Structure formats: structure tokens, C-alpha cells
Amino acid sequence: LERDALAERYATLSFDVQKIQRAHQAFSQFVGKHLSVAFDTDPEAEIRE
Amino acid sequence: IQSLTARAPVWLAAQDTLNQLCEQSGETLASSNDVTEYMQQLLEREREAT
């Protein structure tokens, strides 16, 4: 009965760690494919002008 | 010509520091997407090291 709780809690913690790791992977993928034009000014506006 | 000239020293400084940064790195850079690819590789290695 005691060890059941530890298994459950460990499951949640491992899930959380995996979530963080994948979030870092996503940001790395992003910057690999993205910075060339990141945060630049909106072209729709200027074309309209 | 004036626009190209105003952009000339900016371009030259870009190339200069690009060469310096390229030499500071083991891998040699050749294109913008290549630069960003190297950057994400650098982040990956940093994460593993920490």
C-alpha cells in the first residue's frame, strides 16, 4: 500500500521531466529554423501603406 | 550608389565579424539557415554539458 503511492508520484514526476525536455527541444528546433526573420516588422501594414 | 555605399561599410563589418565568429567556431558557416542550424546545434551541446 505504501509503495503504490511512490509509484504514482514517480510517474507524475517523470512525465513532467519529459515535458520540460520536449519543450527545450521545440525551442531549439524553432531557433534552428526561425531566427532569420524573427520579431521583424509586419509586412501587411507596410504593403497596405 | 549612395544606398549601396551606406550599406557598404555595414556589409564589410558584417563579413569581418562573420569570418571572426566562423573561425571562433569549429564548423565553418556559409549561409543564413546554416548559421541558425549551427546555433541550434550549439544550444543542444550546451544542454547536454550542463
Side-chain angles (χ1 to χ4, degrees):
Chain A
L1 175 63
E2 173 57 21
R3 188 259 298 169
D4 293 337
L6 298 180
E8 181 293 3
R9 187 178 169 209
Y10 174 83
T12 63
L13 299 187
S14 65
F15 169 92
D16 180 41
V17 169
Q18 292 295 334
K19 187 181 176 181
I20 299 294
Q21 288 178 353
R22 182 153 169 130
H24 184 85
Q25 180 50 228
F27 273 99
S28 70
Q29 177 65 34
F30 166 100
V31 298
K33 162 265 181 180
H34 189 287
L35 270 283
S36 314
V37 188
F39 311 102
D40 199 13
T41 176
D42 184 346
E44 149 47 41
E46 304 177 2
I47 288 168
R48 155 201 41 51
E49 188 182 342
Chain B
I1 282 171
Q2 181 64 287
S3 305
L4 293 167
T5 302
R7 171 257 164 170
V10 184
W11 166 81
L12 186 57
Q15 299 304 102
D16 297 333
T17 192
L18 165 65
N19 301 326
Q20 177 278 306
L21 188 55
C22 183
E23 286 298 334
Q24 181 171 359
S25 294
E27 183 57 28
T28 182
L29 286 302
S31 59
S32 60
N33 56 359
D34 176 50
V35 160
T36 55
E37 281 299 336
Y38 179 83
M39 196 167 196
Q40 69 157 350
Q41 295 155 29
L42 191 69
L43 279 307
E44 293 281 38
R45 286 153 65 197
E46 199 275 350
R47 185 261 183 180
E48 297 314 311
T50 189

XYZ file of all heavy atoms in Angstrom:
789
model
N 0.828 -1.198 0.000
C 0.000 0.000 0.000
C 0.866 1.254 0.000
O 0.548 2.238 -0.673
C -0.940 -0.020 1.205
C -1.811 1.213 1.439
C -2.761 1.426 0.280
C -2.582 1.047 2.733
N 1.965 1.236 0.757
C 2.873 2.378 0.778
C 3.534 2.598 -0.580
O 3.651 3.738 -1.042
C 3.935 2.168 1.857
C 5.040 3.203 1.876
C 4.515 4.613 2.039
O 3.377 4.768 2.529
O 5.240 5.565 1.680
N 3.984 1.521 -1.221
C 4.756 1.641 -2.455
C 3.888 2.066 -3.633
O 4.400 2.634 -4.610
C 5.466 0.317 -2.741
C 6.454 0.360 -3.893
C 5.867 -0.227 -5.162
N 5.536 -1.637 -4.978
C 4.817 -2.363 -5.824
N 4.353 -1.852 -6.953
N 4.565 -3.637 -5.533
N 2.585 1.794 -3.567
C 1.692 2.257 -4.627
C 1.793 3.772 -4.806
O 1.889 4.280 -5.936
C 0.258 1.846 -4.304
C 0.059 0.343 -4.351
O 0.858 -0.342 -5.024
O -0.890 -0.152 -3.709
N 1.771 4.511 -3.692
C 1.836 5.966 -3.762
C 3.146 6.434 -4.381
O 3.162 7.384 -5.175
C 1.670 6.561 -2.363
N 4.257 5.797 -4.017
C 5.537 6.183 -4.596
C 5.547 5.943 -6.097
O 6.061 6.769 -6.857
C 6.676 5.417 -3.927
C 6.876 5.656 -2.429
C 8.038 4.825 -1.918
C 7.101 7.129 -2.148
N 4.985 4.820 -6.546
C 4.933 4.570 -7.983
C 4.137 5.657 -8.697
O 4.570 6.182 -9.733
C 4.326 3.196 -8.258
N 2.978 6.017 -8.149
C 2.151 7.058 -8.757
C 2.904 8.383 -8.837
O 2.966 9.034 -9.897
C 0.848 7.151 -7.947
C -0.253 8.143 -8.355
C 0.093 9.620 -8.213
O 1.229 9.974 -7.842
O -0.809 10.445 -8.466
N 3.495 8.799 -7.717
C 4.184 10.081 -7.672
C 5.366 10.099 -8.633
O 5.606 11.097 -9.330
C 4.623 10.347 -6.235
C 5.220 11.706 -5.976
C 5.552 11.846 -4.499
N 6.353 13.032 -4.227
C 7.217 13.146 -3.228
N 7.386 12.174 -2.346
N 7.920 14.268 -3.105
N 6.108 8.996 -8.695
C 7.224 8.899 -9.624
C 6.746 9.010 -11.065
O 7.406 9.639 -11.900
C 7.962 7.582 -9.408
C 9.050 7.321 -10.421
C 10.307 7.875 -10.267
C 8.819 6.529 -11.531
C 11.303 7.644 -11.181
C 9.807 6.293 -12.452
C 11.048 6.852 -12.274
O 12.040 6.617 -13.194
N 5.614 8.380 -11.381
C 5.064 8.505 -12.726
C 4.833 9.968 -13.079
O 5.256 10.442 -14.147
C 3.762 7.715 -12.834
N 4.178 10.709 -12.183
C 3.916 12.117 -12.485
C 5.215 12.897 -12.674
O 5.332 13.710 -13.603
C 3.073 12.755 -11.385
O 3.797 12.728 -10.150
C 1.750 12.028 -11.222
N 6.200 12.671 -11.805
C 7.446 13.433 -11.915
C 8.175 13.129 -13.222
O 8.708 14.042 -13.873
C 8.343 13.141 -10.714
C 7.776 13.519 -9.342
C 8.832 13.338 -8.270
C 7.263 14.950 -9.333
N 8.214 11.859 -13.622
C 8.863 11.514 -14.882
C 8.145 12.166 -16.055
O 8.787 12.665 -16.994
C 8.896 9.997 -15.057
O 7.585 9.476 -15.177
N 6.813 12.177 -16.016
C 6.060 12.840 -17.075
C 6.444 14.311 -17.162
O 6.650 14.856 -18.256
C 4.562 12.683 -16.812
C 3.697 13.549 -17.681
C 3.203 13.068 -18.874
C 3.361 14.833 -17.293
C 2.405 13.850 -19.675
C 2.564 15.624 -18.092
C 2.082 15.130 -19.285
N 6.557 14.969 -16.009
C 6.913 16.385 -16.004
C 8.296 16.609 -16.613
O 8.503 17.541 -17.405
C 6.861 16.930 -14.581
C 7.219 18.398 -14.512
O 6.777 19.157 -15.400
O 7.939 18.792 -13.572
N 9.267 15.769 -16.243
C 10.611 15.932 -16.791
C 10.589 15.786 -18.306
O 11.241 16.552 -19.033
C 11.589 14.931 -16.154
C 12.902 14.921 -16.926
C 11.840 15.288 -14.708
N 9.865 14.786 -18.808
C 9.787 14.614 -20.256
C 9.161 15.833 -20.919
O 9.596 16.256 -21.998
C 9.003 13.350 -20.600
C 9.714 12.076 -20.204
C 10.994 11.877 -20.984
O 11.133 12.367 -22.103
N 11.947 11.172 -20.384
N 8.134 16.406 -20.294
C 7.517 17.604 -20.855
C 8.533 18.733 -20.978
O 8.615 19.404 -22.016
C 6.331 18.034 -19.991
C 5.523 19.176 -20.578
C 4.378 19.570 -19.655
C 3.625 20.778 -20.179
N 2.522 21.173 -19.272
N 9.328 18.951 -19.929
C 10.325 20.019 -19.985
C 11.338 19.752 -21.091
O 11.722 20.658 -21.849
C 11.022 20.175 -18.620
C 10.011 20.547 -17.537
C 12.132 21.211 -18.703
C 9.387 21.911 -17.719
N 11.807 18.509 -21.187
C 12.814 18.191 -22.191
C 12.284 18.449 -23.593
O 12.976 19.037 -24.437
C 13.253 16.736 -22.042
C 14.112 16.477 -20.823
C 14.488 15.022 -20.682
O 14.007 14.166 -21.425
N 15.357 14.731 -19.721
N 11.047 18.027 -23.861
C 10.478 18.271 -25.180
C 10.262 19.758 -25.434
O 10.374 20.213 -26.577
C 9.169 17.507 -25.357
C 8.594 17.721 -26.741
C 7.729 16.584 -27.229
N 7.014 16.987 -28.436
C 6.968 16.293 -29.567
N 7.625 15.152 -29.711
N 6.250 16.760 -30.584
N 9.927 20.531 -24.401
C 9.796 21.972 -24.602
C 11.122 22.583 -25.047
O 11.164 23.418 -25.967
C 9.303 22.643 -23.323
N 12.219 22.176 -24.409
C 13.524 22.658 -24.853
C 13.812 22.224 -26.282
O 14.362 22.996 -27.078
C 14.632 22.157 -23.935
C 15.982 22.698 -24.285
N 16.438 23.915 -23.828
C 16.962 22.203 -25.078
C 17.650 24.137 -24.303
N 17.991 23.113 -25.065
N 13.468 20.982 -26.620
C 13.667 20.521 -27.988
C 12.900 21.392 -28.973
O 13.411 21.732 -30.047
C 13.229 19.063 -28.112
C 13.399 18.471 -29.498
C 14.778 18.711 -30.072
O 14.921 19.133 -31.220
N 15.804 18.451 -29.270
N 11.666 21.755 -28.624
C 10.856 22.590 -29.503
C 11.504 23.950 -29.715
O 11.593 24.436 -30.846
C 9.451 22.757 -28.926
N 11.959 24.586 -28.634
C 12.602 25.890 -28.792
C 13.878 25.791 -29.626
O 14.169 26.679 -30.436
C 12.906 26.517 -27.434
C 11.776 27.321 -26.865
C 10.932 26.791 -25.914
C 11.574 28.624 -27.275
C 9.903 27.540 -25.389
C 10.549 29.380 -26.760
C 9.710 28.838 -25.813
N 14.660 24.728 -29.432
C 15.873 24.575 -30.230
C 15.542 24.403 -31.705
O 16.161 25.037 -32.569
C 16.682 23.381 -29.730
O 16.027 22.164 -30.033
N 14.565 23.550 -32.013
C 14.129 23.364 -33.393
C 13.705 24.701 -33.986
O 14.105 25.079 -35.102
C 12.965 22.370 -33.399
C 12.292 22.079 -34.722
C 13.216 21.401 -35.705
O 14.079 20.613 -35.316
N 13.013 21.666 -36.988
N 12.914 25.446 -33.217
C 12.450 26.761 -33.624
C 13.623 27.642 -34.022
O 13.693 28.120 -35.156
C 11.650 27.381 -32.474
C 11.396 28.852 -32.617
C 10.181 29.309 -33.080
C 12.352 29.778 -32.248
C 9.929 30.652 -33.193
C 12.112 31.127 -32.367
C 10.896 31.567 -32.839
N 14.569 27.851 -33.107
C 15.646 28.786 -33.422
C 16.484 28.266 -34.578
O 17.055 29.051 -35.344
C 16.529 29.084 -32.194
C 15.710 29.745 -31.101
C 17.237 27.834 -31.704
N 16.584 26.946 -34.728
C 17.297 26.405 -35.871
C 16.661 26.816 -37.182
O 17.358 27.076 -38.168
N 15.330 26.892 -37.208
C 14.603 27.123 -38.452
C 13.995 28.522 -38.590
O 13.368 28.799 -39.614
C 13.519 26.034 -38.593
C 12.375 26.273 -39.569
C 11.186 26.864 -38.817
C 9.984 27.110 -39.704
N 8.880 27.677 -38.892
N 14.188 29.421 -37.620
C 13.286 30.556 -37.470
C 13.937 31.933 -37.358
O 13.359 32.901 -37.857
C 12.417 30.335 -36.229
C 11.303 31.316 -36.088
N 11.511 32.627 -35.713
C 9.970 31.183 -36.275
C 10.351 33.255 -35.661
N 9.400 32.400 -35.994
N 15.095 32.066 -36.705
C 15.600 33.394 -36.346
C 15.823 34.320 -37.530
O 15.863 35.542 -37.351
C 16.900 33.283 -35.552
C 16.765 33.189 -34.032
C 16.475 34.571 -33.485
C 15.665 32.260 -33.641
N 15.974 33.784 -38.740
C 16.350 34.654 -39.849
C 15.376 35.818 -40.014
O 15.746 36.857 -40.571
C 16.440 33.852 -41.148
O 17.159 32.646 -40.947
N 14.136 35.667 -39.544
C 13.106 36.683 -39.745
C 12.321 36.946 -38.464
O 11.310 37.656 -38.482
C 12.168 36.261 -40.892
C 11.203 37.383 -41.253
C 12.977 35.841 -42.113
N 12.772 36.388 -37.344
C 12.011 36.505 -36.105
C 11.859 37.963 -35.682
O 12.766 38.780 -35.859
C 12.693 35.718 -34.984
N 10.698 38.282 -35.116
C 10.424 39.562 -34.472
C 10.572 40.756 -35.403
O 10.747 41.885 -34.923
C 11.315 39.769 -33.239
C 11.339 38.597 -32.303
C 12.402 37.718 -32.287
C 10.290 38.384 -31.428
C 12.417 36.648 -31.425
C 10.299 37.319 -30.564
C 11.361 36.446 -30.561
N 10.527 40.554 -36.715
C 10.640 41.686 -37.619
C 9.282 42.377 -37.778
O 8.241 41.888 -37.332
C 11.195 41.241 -38.970
C 11.768 42.393 -39.766
O 11.954 43.482 -39.184
O 12.040 42.209 -40.971
N 9.308 43.548 -38.411
C 8.107 44.360 -38.561
C 7.132 43.734 -39.560
O 7.535 43.063 -40.515
C 8.471 45.779 -38.999
O 7.275 46.530 -39.232
C 9.311 45.764 -40.273
N 5.844 43.968 -39.332
C 4.775 43.292 -40.073
C 4.694 43.809 -41.507
O 4.563 45.022 -41.711
C 3.446 43.508 -39.357
C 2.295 42.753 -40.000
O 2.440 42.272 -41.143
O 1.240 42.626 -39.349
N 4.779 42.944 -42.524
C 4.712 43.445 -43.907
C 3.313 43.818 -44.375
O 3.186 44.668 -45.263
C 5.286 42.285 -44.732
C 5.137 41.089 -43.891
C 5.169 41.527 -42.466
N 2.261 43.186 -43.848
C 0.908 43.561 -44.249
C 0.706 45.063 -44.103
O 0.213 45.734 -45.020
C -0.116 42.783 -43.413
C -1.444 43.503 -43.140
C -2.047 44.143 -44.380
O -2.003 43.509 -45.456
O -2.548 45.283 -44.280
N 1.093 45.608 -42.949
C 0.924 47.037 -42.706
C 1.617 47.864 -43.779
O 1.013 48.765 -44.376
C 1.489 47.388 -41.332
N 2.885 47.565 -44.043
C 3.673 48.424 -44.913
C 3.205 48.312 -46.356
O 3.187 49.307 -47.093
C 5.150 48.066 -44.772
C 5.633 48.154 -43.327
C 7.076 47.736 -43.159
O 7.717 47.406 -44.179
O 7.564 47.727 -42.008
N 2.823 47.107 -46.777
C 2.245 46.931 -48.105
C 0.959 47.738 -48.225
O 0.703 48.384 -49.252
C 2.004 45.435 -48.382
C 3.342 44.726 -48.619
C 1.088 45.250 -49.589
C 3.252 43.216 -48.618
N 0.130 47.722 -47.179
C -1.105 48.492 -47.243
C -0.774 49.971 -47.414
O -1.395 50.679 -48.218
C -1.950 48.252 -45.981
C -2.933 49.391 -45.621
C -3.408 49.420 -44.164
N -2.438 49.157 -43.101
C -1.260 49.754 -42.966
N -0.768 50.549 -43.900
N -0.564 49.561 -41.849
N 0.221 50.448 -46.663
C 0.618 51.850 -46.748
C 1.087 52.212 -48.152
O 0.700 53.249 -48.707
C 1.728 52.135 -45.742
C 2.068 53.609 -45.626
C 3.199 53.874 -44.652
O 3.494 52.987 -43.826
O 3.791 54.973 -44.719
N 23.784 54.520 -55.798
C 25.170 54.413 -55.349
C 25.284 54.813 -53.884
O 26.035 54.205 -53.119
C 26.092 55.256 -56.247
C 26.357 54.503 -57.555
C 27.405 55.584 -55.525
C 27.075 55.302 -58.612
N 24.568 55.861 -53.480
C 24.597 56.284 -52.082
C 24.036 55.206 -51.161
O 24.567 54.980 -50.071
C 23.825 57.593 -51.908
C 23.830 58.121 -50.480
C 25.220 58.502 -50.003
O 26.049 57.634 -49.723
N 25.478 59.801 -49.900
N 22.944 54.558 -51.563
C 22.390 53.468 -50.766
C 23.378 52.316 -50.671
O 23.642 51.785 -49.585
C 21.072 52.996 -51.381
O 20.161 54.068 -51.532
N 23.940 51.917 -51.812
C 24.935 50.854 -51.817
C 26.135 51.233 -50.960
O 26.726 50.381 -50.299
C 25.369 50.560 -53.252
C 24.289 49.938 -54.144
C 24.713 49.998 -55.601
C 23.985 48.508 -53.723
N 26.506 52.513 -50.957
C 27.650 52.968 -50.178
C 27.346 52.955 -48.687
O 28.164 52.498 -47.884
C 28.050 54.371 -50.631
O 28.357 54.352 -52.030
C 29.257 54.870 -49.861
N 26.175 53.459 -48.296
C 25.770 53.393 -46.898
C 25.722 51.948 -46.423
O 26.028 51.654 -45.261
C 24.409 54.066 -46.712
N 25.340 51.033 -47.310
C 25.337 49.614 -46.982
C 26.712 48.960 -47.123
O 26.907 47.847 -46.624
C 24.285 48.917 -47.854
C 24.281 47.400 -47.808
C 24.931 46.845 -49.073
N 25.297 45.439 -48.970
C 25.688 44.692 -49.994
N 25.566 45.112 -51.243
N 26.193 43.484 -49.760
N 27.663 49.625 -47.782
C 28.984 49.034 -47.986
C 29.728 48.784 -46.682
O 30.074 47.623 -46.404
C 29.792 49.927 -48.933
N 30.023 49.792 -45.855
C 30.759 49.501 -44.620
C 29.992 48.593 -43.683
O 30.609 47.806 -42.956
C 30.986 50.888 -44.008
C 29.857 51.689 -44.497
C 29.554 51.186 -45.882
N 28.663 48.670 -43.689
C 27.866 47.742 -42.895
C 28.101 46.317 -43.374
O 28.325 45.399 -42.576
C 26.377 48.121 -42.968
C 25.549 47.221 -42.068
C 26.182 49.581 -42.586
N 28.078 46.114 -44.692
C 28.339 44.789 -45.237
C 29.744 44.322 -44.890
O 29.959 43.152 -44.556
C 28.153 44.788 -46.753
C 28.728 43.570 -47.395
C 28.153 42.338 -47.473
C 30.004 43.461 -48.036
N 28.986 41.468 -48.129
C 30.130 42.131 -48.487
C 31.049 44.357 -48.274
C 31.257 41.675 -49.164
C 32.172 43.902 -48.951
C 32.267 42.573 -49.387
N 30.728 45.211 -45.017
C 32.107 44.827 -44.751
C 32.295 44.440 -43.290
O 32.972 43.456 -42.982
C 33.051 45.964 -45.150
C 34.552 45.673 -45.075
C 34.926 44.477 -45.936
C 35.336 46.904 -45.507
N 31.716 45.217 -42.368
C 31.768 44.854 -40.958
C 31.078 43.519 -40.712
O 31.560 42.695 -39.922
C 31.123 45.949 -40.110
N 29.938 43.296 -41.366
C 29.253 42.019 -41.236
C 30.157 40.874 -41.671
O 30.286 39.874 -40.967
C 27.966 42.033 -42.059
N 30.794 41.009 -42.836
C 31.688 39.963 -43.320
C 32.867 39.762 -42.376
O 33.276 38.626 -42.109
C 32.181 40.299 -44.726
C 31.088 40.415 -45.765
C 30.234 39.170 -45.860
O 29.121 39.123 -45.337
N 30.759 38.149 -46.525
N 33.443 40.856 -41.877
C 34.590 40.759 -40.980
C 34.236 39.969 -39.728
O 34.894 38.976 -39.386
C 35.062 42.161 -40.599
C 35.542 42.956 -41.791
O 35.988 42.339 -42.779
O 35.461 44.203 -41.740
N 33.195 40.409 -39.020
C 32.816 39.706 -37.805
C 32.282 38.316 -38.111
O 32.402 37.419 -37.275
C 31.794 40.511 -37.006
O 31.648 39.936 -35.700
C 30.451 40.535 -37.699
N 31.691 38.113 -39.287
C 31.275 36.775 -39.683
C 32.472 35.846 -39.787
O 32.432 34.715 -39.303
C 30.523 36.831 -41.011
C 30.345 35.492 -41.732
C 29.469 34.572 -40.912
C 29.756 35.703 -43.113
N 33.534 36.297 -40.447
C 34.741 35.483 -40.544
C 35.326 35.217 -39.162
O 35.753 34.098 -38.859
C 35.768 36.171 -41.439
C 35.246 36.413 -42.846
O 34.481 35.611 -43.377
N 35.658 37.524 -43.454
N 35.362 36.246 -38.313
C 35.912 36.062 -36.973
C 35.093 35.045 -36.180
O 35.646 34.149 -35.532
C 35.969 37.406 -36.243
C 36.462 37.320 -34.804
C 35.369 36.914 -33.837
O 34.306 37.535 -33.778
N 35.619 35.847 -33.085
N 33.770 35.179 -36.213
C 32.896 34.262 -35.493
C 32.974 32.858 -36.079
O 32.900 31.863 -35.351
C 31.467 34.800 -35.539
C 30.364 34.140 -34.712
C 30.741 34.062 -33.251
C 29.072 34.921 -34.894
N 33.119 32.764 -37.400
C 33.294 31.477 -38.060
C 34.568 30.792 -37.595
O 34.584 29.579 -37.361
C 33.322 31.688 -39.575
S 33.441 30.188 -40.559
N 35.650 31.555 -37.464
C 36.908 30.987 -37.005
C 36.851 30.619 -35.532
O 37.463 29.627 -35.119
C 38.046 31.975 -37.256
C 38.448 32.091 -38.709
C 38.966 30.784 -39.275
O 39.471 29.956 -38.488
O 38.859 30.585 -40.504
N 36.124 31.401 -34.733
C 35.937 31.056 -33.329
C 35.210 29.729 -33.182
O 35.352 29.051 -32.158
C 35.166 32.173 -32.624
C 34.926 31.948 -31.142
C 34.361 33.178 -30.467
O 34.153 34.211 -31.102
N 34.117 33.076 -29.166
N 34.429 29.346 -34.187
C 33.712 28.082 -34.185
C 34.495 27.025 -34.953
O 35.216 27.325 -35.907
C 32.329 28.250 -34.812
O 31.508 29.093 -34.025
N 34.341 25.772 -34.526
C 34.965 24.679 -35.254
C 34.407 24.535 -36.660
O 35.159 24.376 -37.626
N 33.086 24.582 -36.789
C 32.442 24.433 -38.083
C 32.448 25.761 -38.830
O 32.377 26.837 -38.229
C 31.008 23.935 -37.912
C 30.265 23.674 -39.208
C 30.977 22.674 -40.098
O 31.711 21.816 -39.560
O 30.803 22.742 -41.333
N 32.541 25.676 -40.154
C 32.567 26.861 -40.997
C 31.178 27.158 -41.547
O 30.452 26.249 -41.965
C 33.564 26.694 -42.146
O 33.594 27.893 -42.931
C 33.201 25.510 -43.035
N 30.812 28.437 -41.539
C 29.476 28.884 -41.904
C 29.461 29.391 -43.340
O 30.452 29.946 -43.824
C 29.000 29.986 -40.955
C 28.595 29.537 -39.545
C 27.486 28.498 -39.599
C 29.789 29.001 -38.766
N 28.335 29.178 -44.029
C 28.209 29.572 -45.426
C 26.872 30.203 -45.801
O 26.794 30.837 -46.858
C 28.453 28.363 -46.343
N 25.828 30.063 -44.981
C 24.524 30.612 -45.324
C 23.734 30.891 -44.054
O 24.038 30.368 -42.979
C 23.744 29.665 -46.246
O 23.545 28.406 -45.627
N 22.714 31.739 -44.195
C 21.932 32.174 -43.039
C 21.287 30.990 -42.330
O 21.413 30.829 -41.106
C 20.864 33.169 -43.491
O 19.995 32.572 -44.436
N 20.593 30.138 -43.086
C 19.999 28.957 -42.474
C 21.078 28.056 -41.897
O 20.865 27.396 -40.876
C 19.158 28.189 -43.491
C 19.941 27.808 -44.724
O 21.123 28.126 -44.848
N 19.287 27.096 -45.636
N 22.251 28.020 -42.533
C 23.372 27.279 -41.968
C 23.803 27.868 -40.630
O 24.116 27.129 -39.689
C 24.541 27.278 -42.951
C 25.768 26.597 -42.389
O 25.640 25.466 -41.875
O 26.862 27.196 -42.464
N 23.823 29.199 -40.525
C 24.175 29.841 -39.261
C 23.182 29.451 -38.174
O 23.565 29.100 -37.051
C 24.244 31.369 -39.440
C 24.127 32.074 -38.104
C 25.535 31.765 -40.127
N 21.887 29.500 -38.489
C 20.887 29.132 -37.487
C 20.960 27.648 -37.134
O 20.740 27.264 -35.975
C 19.492 29.509 -37.980
O 19.255 28.911 -39.260
C 19.352 31.019 -38.083
N 21.267 26.798 -38.113
C 21.463 25.381 -37.835
C 22.595 25.184 -36.836
O 22.460 24.448 -35.846
C 21.763 24.643 -39.139
C 20.545 24.339 -39.986
C 19.545 23.455 -39.271
O 19.957 22.714 -38.355
O 18.350 23.502 -39.629
N 23.727 25.845 -37.083
C 24.836 25.770 -36.142
C 24.422 26.277 -34.771
O 24.839 25.730 -33.742
C 26.030 26.569 -36.657
C 27.210 26.552 -35.713
C 28.107 25.496 -35.714
C 27.424 27.586 -34.820
C 29.179 25.471 -34.857
C 28.493 27.572 -33.958
C 29.371 26.510 -33.981
O 30.444 26.487 -33.122
N 23.611 27.332 -34.731
C 23.193 27.880 -33.446
C 22.394 26.852 -32.652
O 22.606 26.678 -31.444
C 22.380 29.154 -33.655
C 22.236 29.970 -32.390
S 21.611 31.632 -32.693
C 22.032 32.420 -31.144
N 21.457 26.162 -33.308
C 20.673 25.187 -32.557
C 21.539 24.006 -32.134
O 21.337 23.444 -31.048
C 19.454 24.697 -33.347
C 19.716 23.819 -34.563
C 18.507 22.965 -34.905
O 17.544 22.889 -34.139
N 18.561 22.300 -36.052
N 22.514 23.627 -32.963
C 23.471 22.612 -32.524
C 24.194 23.063 -31.260
O 24.413 22.270 -30.332
C 24.476 22.319 -33.639
C 23.872 21.682 -34.881
C 24.699 21.942 -36.124
O 25.918 22.101 -36.057
N 24.034 21.977 -37.276
N 24.574 24.339 -31.211
C 25.254 24.869 -30.037
C 24.368 24.783 -28.801
O 24.833 24.395 -27.722
C 25.678 26.314 -30.298
C 26.636 26.942 -29.286
C 28.009 26.306 -29.382
C 26.724 28.442 -29.511
N 23.089 25.136 -28.938
C 22.182 25.016 -27.795
C 22.069 23.567 -27.328
O 22.055 23.291 -26.120
C 20.800 25.574 -28.138
C 20.569 27.090 -28.074
C 20.991 27.640 -26.724
C 21.271 27.829 -29.193
N 21.985 22.630 -28.270
C 21.893 21.220 -27.896
C 23.109 20.795 -27.075
O 22.982 20.176 -26.004
C 21.776 20.364 -29.159
C 20.484 20.562 -29.930
C 19.315 19.812 -29.328
O 19.228 19.749 -28.085
O 18.481 19.294 -30.102
N 24.302 21.123 -27.571
C 25.521 20.750 -26.864
C 25.570 21.388 -25.479
O 25.989 20.752 -24.504
C 26.746 21.147 -27.689
C 26.975 20.254 -28.896
C 27.715 20.971 -30.023
N 29.070 21.353 -29.652
C 29.807 22.244 -30.306
N 29.357 22.852 -31.391
N 31.032 22.522 -29.866
N 25.152 22.651 -25.379
C 25.132 23.331 -24.088
C 24.238 22.603 -23.090
O 24.615 22.405 -21.923
C 24.659 24.769 -24.292
C 24.999 25.722 -23.174
C 23.987 25.685 -22.046
O 22.923 25.053 -22.212
O 24.254 26.300 -20.992
N 23.046 22.197 -23.528
C 22.139 21.475 -22.640
C 22.769 20.175 -22.153
O 22.729 19.852 -20.954
C 20.819 21.209 -23.359
C 19.754 20.573 -22.487
C 19.693 19.069 -22.716
N 18.632 18.431 -21.948
C 18.378 17.130 -21.965
N 19.025 16.309 -22.776
N 17.446 16.642 -21.150
N 23.376 19.417 -23.067
C 23.994 18.164 -22.642
C 25.103 18.417 -21.621
O 25.213 17.700 -20.612
C 24.536 17.403 -23.852
C 23.473 16.976 -24.859
C 22.259 16.343 -24.202
O 22.441 15.440 -23.360
O 21.125 16.746 -24.539
N 25.929 19.438 -21.861
C 27.039 19.716 -20.955
C 26.546 20.069 -19.556
O 27.098 19.590 -18.553
C 27.899 20.846 -21.516
N 25.521 20.916 -19.463
C 25.028 21.276 -18.139
C 24.416 20.070 -17.439
O 24.577 19.909 -16.220
C 24.026 22.425 -18.238
O 23.706 22.913 -16.926
C 22.756 21.998 -18.941
